[PDB]
Protein backbone atom coordinates (compact mmCIF):
# COMPACT_ATOMS: atom_id res chain seq x y z
CA UNK A 1 0.00 0.00 0.00
CA UNK A 2 0.91 3.75 -0.26
CA UNK A 3 3.36 5.19 2.33
CA UNK A 4 4.86 8.71 2.84
CA UNK A 5 8.31 9.73 1.44
CA UNK A 6 10.81 7.62 3.46
CA UNK A 7 14.55 7.59 2.52
CA UNK A 8 17.69 5.47 2.35
CA UNK A 9 20.34 7.31 4.48
CA UNK A 10 24.05 7.44 5.46
CA UNK A 11 25.93 9.22 8.32
CA UNK A 12 28.74 11.52 7.08
CA UNK A 13 29.57 13.84 10.06
CA UNK A 14 27.48 12.58 13.00
CA UNK A 15 24.34 13.87 11.24
CA UNK A 16 22.44 11.41 9.01
CA UNK A 17 22.01 12.48 5.33
CA UNK A 18 19.55 11.18 2.70
CA UNK A 19 21.21 8.93 0.04
CA UNK A 20 18.78 10.00 -2.67
CA UNK A 21 17.74 13.66 -2.77
CA UNK A 22 21.57 14.07 -2.60
CA UNK A 23 21.94 11.59 -5.52
CA UNK A 24 19.16 13.12 -7.70
CA UNK A 25 20.29 16.72 -6.94
CA UNK A 26 23.87 15.69 -7.91
CA UNK A 27 22.47 14.13 -11.17
CA UNK A 28 20.75 17.49 -11.85
CA UNK A 29 23.94 19.47 -11.00
CA UNK A 30 26.24 17.44 -13.22
CA UNK A 31 23.87 17.74 -16.17
CA UNK A 32 23.68 21.53 -15.59
CA UNK A 33 27.49 21.89 -15.51
CA UNK A 34 27.79 19.48 -18.45
CA UNK A 35 25.53 21.78 -20.51
CA UNK A 36 27.61 24.75 -19.21
CA UNK A 37 30.92 23.20 -20.49
CA UNK A 38 29.30 21.98 -23.77
CA UNK A 39 27.81 25.45 -24.47
CA UNK A 40 31.10 27.24 -23.47
CA UNK A 41 32.98 24.97 -25.95
CA UNK A 42 30.31 25.42 -28.74
CA UNK A 43 29.83 29.20 -28.14
CA UNK A 44 29.24 31.40 -31.25
CA UNK A 45 29.26 35.22 -31.79
CA UNK A 46 29.81 36.28 -35.45
CA UNK A 47 28.34 32.96 -36.61
CA UNK A 48 24.80 31.59 -35.97
CA UNK A 49 24.04 30.05 -32.48
CA UNK A 50 22.95 26.42 -31.98
CA UNK A 51 20.03 25.14 -29.84
CA UNK A 52 21.76 25.27 -26.39
CA UNK A 53 23.14 28.80 -26.94
CA UNK A 54 19.83 30.28 -28.21
CA UNK A 55 18.11 28.55 -25.22
CA UNK A 56 20.49 29.76 -22.42
CA UNK A 57 20.74 33.29 -23.93
CA UNK A 58 16.91 33.59 -24.03
CA UNK A 59 16.90 32.72 -20.29
CA UNK A 60 19.80 35.12 -19.49
CA UNK A 61 18.11 38.10 -21.28
CA UNK A 62 14.69 37.23 -19.74
CA UNK A 63 16.44 37.41 -16.33
CA UNK A 64 18.32 40.60 -17.48
CA UNK A 65 14.98 42.28 -18.38
CA UNK A 66 13.51 41.32 -14.97
CA UNK A 67 16.53 42.38 -12.83
CA UNK A 68 17.15 45.66 -14.77
CA UNK A 69 13.40 46.52 -14.57
CA UNK A 70 13.53 45.90 -10.78
CA UNK A 71 16.95 47.54 -9.87
CA UNK A 72 19.82 49.31 -11.75
CA UNK A 73 22.30 46.67 -13.10
CA UNK A 74 25.14 48.94 -11.77
CA UNK A 75 23.92 48.19 -8.18
CA UNK A 76 23.06 44.45 -8.23
CA UNK A 77 24.52 42.60 -11.34
CA UNK A 78 25.17 39.33 -9.40
CA UNK A 79 21.41 38.67 -8.92
CA UNK A 80 21.20 37.66 -12.64
CA UNK A 81 23.58 34.56 -12.48
CA UNK A 82 22.07 33.63 -9.06
CA UNK A 83 18.59 33.88 -10.69
CA UNK A 84 19.32 31.74 -13.85
CA UNK A 85 20.73 28.80 -11.81
CA UNK A 86 17.68 29.03 -9.53
CA UNK A 87 15.67 28.65 -12.77
CA UNK A 88 17.72 25.92 -14.59
CA UNK A 89 19.14 23.95 -11.60
CA UNK A 90 15.47 23.64 -10.41
CA UNK A 91 14.06 23.02 -13.95
CA UNK A 92 16.19 19.88 -14.66
CA UNK A 93 15.61 18.91 -10.95
CA UNK A 94 11.89 18.36 -11.81
CA UNK A 95 12.14 17.15 -15.46
CA UNK A 96 14.05 13.95 -14.69
CA UNK A 97 10.96 12.69 -12.84
CA UNK A 98 9.23 12.09 -16.19
CA UNK A 99 11.26 9.02 -17.13
CA UNK A 100 9.70 5.77 -15.83
CA UNK A 101 11.57 3.96 -13.06
CA UNK A 102 8.97 2.70 -10.62
CA UNK A 103 8.22 -0.95 -9.83
CA UNK A 104 8.53 2.36 -5.09
CA UNK A 105 11.28 4.13 -7.08
CA UNK A 106 14.37 6.04 -5.87
CA UNK A 107 14.25 8.64 -8.76
CA UNK A 108 11.83 11.17 -7.12
CA UNK A 109 12.73 14.85 -7.87
CA UNK A 110 15.12 16.86 -5.62
CA UNK A 111 12.23 19.13 -4.42
CA UNK A 112 10.17 16.05 -3.23
CA UNK A 113 12.22 16.39 0.06
CA UNK A 114 11.95 19.45 2.36
CA UNK A 115 15.73 19.80 3.06
CA UNK A 116 16.56 20.73 -0.59
CA UNK A 117 14.00 23.56 -0.77
CA UNK A 118 15.01 24.76 2.73
CA UNK A 119 18.68 24.98 1.70
CA UNK A 120 17.83 26.92 -1.52
CA UNK A 121 15.30 29.27 0.17
CA UNK A 122 17.54 29.92 3.24
CA UNK A 123 20.54 30.58 0.92
CA UNK A 124 18.41 33.11 -1.04
CA UNK A 125 17.41 34.68 2.30
CA UNK A 126 20.96 35.19 3.61
CA UNK A 127 21.98 36.39 0.14
CA UNK A 128 19.32 39.12 -0.07
CA UNK A 129 19.96 40.04 3.59
CA UNK A 130 23.65 40.51 2.77
CA UNK A 131 22.49 42.55 -0.22
CA UNK A 132 20.44 44.78 2.08
CA UNK A 133 23.33 45.27 4.50
CA UNK A 134 25.81 45.85 1.66
CA UNK A 135 23.97 48.89 0.26
CA UNK A 136 24.19 50.78 3.61
CA UNK A 137 24.37 48.48 6.69
CA UNK A 138 8.58 48.79 4.12
CA UNK A 139 6.16 51.39 2.65
CA UNK A 140 4.45 52.07 6.05
CA UNK A 141 6.16 51.84 9.51
CA UNK A 142 3.10 50.79 11.52
CA UNK A 143 3.01 47.45 9.60
CA UNK A 144 6.27 46.31 11.37
CA UNK A 145 4.79 42.90 12.47
CA UNK A 146 3.90 41.96 8.86
CA UNK A 147 7.27 43.33 7.80
CA UNK A 148 8.45 41.14 10.67
CA UNK A 149 6.72 38.04 9.19
CA UNK A 150 7.93 38.92 5.64
CA UNK A 151 11.48 37.99 6.69
CA UNK A 152 10.27 34.50 7.84
CA UNK A 153 7.40 34.07 5.32
CA UNK A 154 9.63 34.86 2.27
CA UNK A 155 11.99 31.84 2.83
CA UNK A 156 9.19 29.72 4.42
CA UNK A 157 6.71 30.38 1.54
CA UNK A 158 9.53 29.95 -1.08
CA UNK A 159 10.48 26.58 0.41
CA UNK A 160 6.87 25.46 1.16
CA UNK A 161 5.44 26.38 -2.28
CA UNK A 162 8.39 24.67 -4.05
CA UNK A 163 7.99 21.62 -1.75
CA UNK A 164 4.17 21.34 -1.95
CA UNK A 165 3.94 22.04 -5.71
CA UNK A 166 6.40 19.12 -6.35
CA UNK A 167 5.62 16.74 -3.41
CA UNK A 168 2.07 16.27 -4.81
CA UNK A 169 3.62 14.73 -7.95
CA UNK A 170 5.86 12.54 -5.81
CA UNK A 171 2.58 11.16 -4.30
CA UNK A 172 0.42 11.00 -7.49
CA UNK A 173 3.09 8.91 -9.31
CA UNK A 174 2.43 6.26 -6.60
CA UNK A 175 -1.39 6.74 -6.51
CA UNK A 176 -2.05 5.76 -10.18
CA UNK A 177 0.04 2.63 -9.58
CA UNK A 178 -2.94 1.16 -7.61
CA UNK A 179 -5.07 1.04 -10.82
CA UNK A 180 -4.82 -2.01 -13.22
CA UNK A 181 -1.72 -1.66 -15.41
CA UNK A 182 -3.68 -2.23 -18.63
CA UNK A 183 -5.81 0.93 -18.04
CA UNK A 184 -3.53 2.99 -15.78
CA UNK A 185 -1.54 4.47 -18.68
CA UNK A 186 -3.98 7.21 -19.73
CA UNK A 187 -4.25 9.08 -16.38
CA UNK A 188 -0.54 8.41 -15.94
CA UNK A 189 -0.05 9.98 -19.39
CA UNK A 190 -2.14 13.12 -18.61
CA UNK A 191 -0.36 13.58 -15.27
CA UNK A 192 3.07 13.15 -16.85
CA UNK A 193 2.04 15.83 -19.33
CA UNK A 194 1.01 18.25 -16.57
CA UNK A 195 4.20 17.51 -14.61
CA UNK A 196 6.34 19.51 -17.03
CA UNK A 197 4.02 22.52 -16.93
CA UNK A 198 4.01 22.66 -13.09
CA UNK A 199 7.80 22.03 -12.90
CA UNK A 200 8.50 24.88 -15.37
CA UNK A 201 5.96 27.34 -13.83
CA UNK A 202 7.40 26.54 -10.37
CA UNK A 203 11.03 27.17 -11.47
CA UNK A 204 9.83 30.41 -13.14
CA UNK A 205 8.01 31.80 -10.04
CA UNK A 206 10.86 30.86 -7.63
CA UNK A 207 13.41 32.71 -9.81
CA UNK A 208 11.06 35.72 -10.25
CA UNK A 209 10.26 35.93 -6.49
CA UNK A 210 14.01 35.65 -5.80
CA UNK A 211 14.61 38.70 -8.08
CA UNK A 212 11.63 40.67 -6.67
CA UNK A 213 12.58 39.90 -3.02
CA UNK A 214 16.20 41.01 -3.77
CA UNK A 215 14.82 44.21 -5.31
CA UNK A 216 12.91 44.84 -2.06
CA UNK A 217 15.92 44.09 0.14
CA UNK A 218 18.43 46.43 -1.54
CA UNK A 219 15.95 49.40 -1.57
CA UNK A 220 17.46 52.87 -0.97
Amino acid sequence: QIEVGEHHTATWLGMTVNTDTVLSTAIAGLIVIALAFYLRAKVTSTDVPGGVQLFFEAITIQMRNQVESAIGMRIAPFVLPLAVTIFVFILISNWLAVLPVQYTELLKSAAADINYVLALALFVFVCYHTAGIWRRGGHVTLLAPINLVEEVAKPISLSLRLFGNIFAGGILVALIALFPPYIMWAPNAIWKAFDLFVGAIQAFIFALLTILYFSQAMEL
Binding site: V4, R161, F167, A168, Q202, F204, L208
Partner: protein
Protein backbone atom coordinates in the same frame (compact mmCIF):
# COMPACT_ATOMS: atom_id res chain seq x y z
CA UNK B 1 -9.08 3.22 20.23
CA UNK B 2 -7.32 4.19 16.92
CA UNK B 3 -10.49 4.25 14.64
CA UNK B 4 -11.78 7.61 16.03
CA UNK B 5 -8.40 9.27 15.21
CA UNK B 6 -8.33 7.63 11.75
CA UNK B 7 -11.92 8.85 11.06
CA UNK B 8 -10.84 12.34 12.25
CA UNK B 9 -7.80 12.12 9.91
CA UNK B 10 -10.07 11.33 6.92
CA UNK B 11 -12.62 14.10 7.75
CA UNK B 12 -9.84 16.60 8.60
CA UNK B 13 -7.70 15.69 5.55
CA UNK B 14 -10.89 15.99 3.45
CA UNK B 15 -11.37 19.61 4.66
CA UNK B 16 -7.75 20.45 3.66
CA UNK B 17 -8.44 19.19 0.09
CA UNK B 18 -11.92 20.79 -0.07
CA UNK B 19 -10.71 24.31 0.87
CA UNK B 20 -7.65 23.76 -1.36
CA UNK B 21 -9.70 23.11 -4.52
CA UNK B 22 -12.04 26.08 -3.86
CA UNK B 23 -9.12 28.51 -3.39
CA UNK B 24 -7.12 27.33 -6.39
CA UNK B 25 -9.96 26.71 -8.82
CA UNK B 26 -11.56 30.08 -8.19
CA UNK B 27 -8.20 31.83 -8.15
CA UNK B 28 -7.13 30.46 -11.53
CA UNK B 29 -10.51 31.70 -12.69
CA UNK B 30 -10.27 35.28 -11.45
CA UNK B 31 -6.72 35.38 -12.82
CA UNK B 32 -7.57 33.74 -16.13
CA UNK B 33 -10.57 36.04 -16.43
CA UNK B 34 -8.03 38.85 -16.63
CA UNK B 35 -5.85 37.05 -19.15
CA UNK B 36 -8.53 36.15 -21.69
CA UNK B 37 -10.01 39.64 -21.46
CA UNK B 38 -6.54 41.08 -22.05
CA UNK B 39 -6.02 38.90 -25.11
CA UNK B 40 -9.42 40.12 -26.28
CA UNK B 41 -8.51 43.78 -25.88
CA UNK B 42 -5.16 43.62 -27.70
CA UNK B 43 -5.11 40.28 -29.55
CA UNK B 44 -1.33 40.55 -29.88
CA UNK B 45 -0.52 41.19 -26.20
CA UNK B 46 -0.69 37.49 -25.26
CA UNK B 47 3.09 37.18 -25.41
CA UNK B 48 3.70 39.46 -22.47
CA UNK B 49 0.51 38.70 -20.55
CA UNK B 50 2.00 35.28 -19.66
CA UNK B 51 4.65 36.96 -17.42
CA UNK B 52 2.05 38.30 -14.82
CA UNK B 53 -0.37 35.43 -15.38
CA UNK B 54 2.06 32.62 -14.46
CA UNK B 55 3.25 34.75 -11.50
CA UNK B 56 -0.33 35.01 -10.11
CA UNK B 57 -1.05 31.29 -10.79
CA UNK B 58 2.24 30.41 -9.04
CA UNK B 59 1.02 32.34 -5.95
CA UNK B 60 -2.54 30.90 -6.13
CA UNK B 61 -1.83 27.23 -6.83
CA UNK B 62 0.74 27.37 -3.97
CA UNK B 63 -2.11 27.72 -1.44
CA UNK B 64 -3.59 24.47 -2.91
CA UNK B 65 -0.49 22.27 -3.23
CA UNK B 66 0.81 23.29 0.23
CA UNK B 67 -2.63 22.04 1.46
CA UNK B 68 -2.15 18.77 -0.52
CA UNK B 69 1.28 18.19 1.11
CA UNK B 70 -0.09 18.66 4.64
CA UNK B 71 -3.10 16.47 3.65
CA UNK B 72 -0.69 13.54 3.08
CA UNK B 73 0.78 14.31 6.55
CA UNK B 74 -2.82 14.15 7.93
CA UNK B 75 -3.87 11.01 5.98
CA UNK B 76 -0.77 8.71 5.86
CA UNK B 77 1.47 10.04 8.70
CA UNK B 78 -0.99 11.29 11.40
CA UNK B 79 1.17 13.28 13.84
CA UNK B 80 -1.01 12.10 16.81
CA UNK B 81 -1.93 8.59 18.08
Amino acid sequence: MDPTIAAGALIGGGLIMAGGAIGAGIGDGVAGNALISGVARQPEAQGRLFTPFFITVGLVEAAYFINLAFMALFVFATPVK
